RNA sequence: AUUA
Ligand SMILES: Nc1nc2c(ncn2[C@@H]2O[C@H](COP(=O)(O)OP(=O)(O)NP(=O)(O)O)[C@@H](O)[C@H]2O)c(=O)[nH]1
């Protein structure tokens with residue numbers, strides 16, 4: 001009675017909101033996902049069990065499910081105000097998911113909810129964990145991710161040794177279909193860092209706060225400072241994401257005329273061999289807030305650790 | 312949960328100048344950290360308005376480094392005193408995580424504006 | 425020593441990669457063909473472009 | 475995350 005069919009149209013926003021519950025009523029949903037934790041008593045990069053979330057998938061004209069979810073969570077009252085303030089400071093960035101703060105009663109009391117709109121099913125941390133902890137006995141997440149983004153079809157896995165690199169070298173072409181998604185995620189990350197610096201917000205960026213479309217959320221561990229003096233910490237993010245940048249060949253679009261995958265290739269003259277400025281431009285475009293000096297020529301390095309870092 | 316340095320740090324004391332040996336007695340709330348290998352300062356605060364130099368004494372005394380600073384930032388503080396203004400500095404080359412640490416601790420333990 | 429000199433002088437300091445010297449100054453070309461399908465796509469006819 |  002009410003509740004489920006009233007919470008549904010309260011989560012339902014003002015745009016189109018053709019929603020369907022993910023097998024729940026007014027209660028939360030439990031999933032098994034990967035996180036990156038550091039909270040003074042636990043640390044690591046493992047798969048924990050999420051507990052406090054209600055998810056509503058979205059439909060469209062022909063009443064078939066689509067890759068869009070409304071994730072609404074409940075928590076205390078102080079985090080409500082803190083997240084609302086930070087989002088109000090950060091809402092104008094085009095790389096931040098659209099939040100919605102409301103209050104709804106489950107009993108005689110009224111509890112607050114925070115709803116995020118149009119997220120994907122999996123985050124970037126899920127993809128990184130799936131590719132860095134491969135096990136052919138159970139790889140359902142990787143297969144689902146590959147088939148939901150038109151990298152292959154469901155009958156591609158009926159083959160045996162479909163994952164091998166020596167046998168079936170076509171898996172490289174299959175993997176190289178996520179590079180554009182990764183590149184757009186990198187660009188949106190740079191945009192988010194610029195917005196955080198301009199707004200005066202201090203926080204650490206993790207892989208599980210970004211979905212596979214590039215949008216950011218979860219400002220629950222941030223603080224506030226004077227405008228223009230913000231500082232993001234992006235060590236673990238880039239360091240963990242680095243091995244995936246070459247498997248998927250994310251920088252293929254940089255060999256075309258206007259960084260567009262539909263135009264012909266760039267025609268360099270055969271007599272050019274320096275390329276010392278292009279490397280700096282690429283570093284400034286994709287790794288702007290990585291704070292450690294980068295030497296395009298390793299003859300200027302200070303020791304072997306710097307040589308490794310720049311190579 | 313990825314927090315920015317739960318266990319905090321302790322202390323702020325000593326000196327500063329603008330041209331090498333201009334550090335006379337004490338012109339800095341040189342802030343934080345006594346690491347496990349020795350005293351290694353992180354943040355510098357200045358009730359003054361323009362400084363490029365400082366000199367923190369440590370251990371041997373003979374070894375006290377003439378630190379190169381960086382262009383400052385300014386803010387006003389919500390102290391019980393009332394109107395109080397400093398000009399913020401960090402030791403040059405301080406990586407992002409350390410500045411985040413000191414800024415978070417300063418903002419979350421003591422009140423500022 | 426005329427084509428080599430012609431491409432050396434175009435360099436801005438006299439240095440050029442070694443991999444483009446045979447590509448722009450050689451007089452003879454040798455092609456090794458595995459099968460006929462590859463042959464009809466590379467050197468079909470009497471003159472080809474490469 | 476298992477602090478909601
Ligand atoms: N993108 C997405 N994530 C989901 C969905 N369902 C569950 N999740 C999981 O729910 C988690 C949301 O946690 P959230 O509190 O927003 O961020 P957080 O990383 O836990 N940090 P904190 O709340 O302390 O600031 C994500 O890590 C994600 O893996 C979904 O449909 N889409």
Ligand SMILES: [Zn+2]
Pocket residue numbers: 293294295298300301302306307309310
């Ligand atoms: Zn180097």
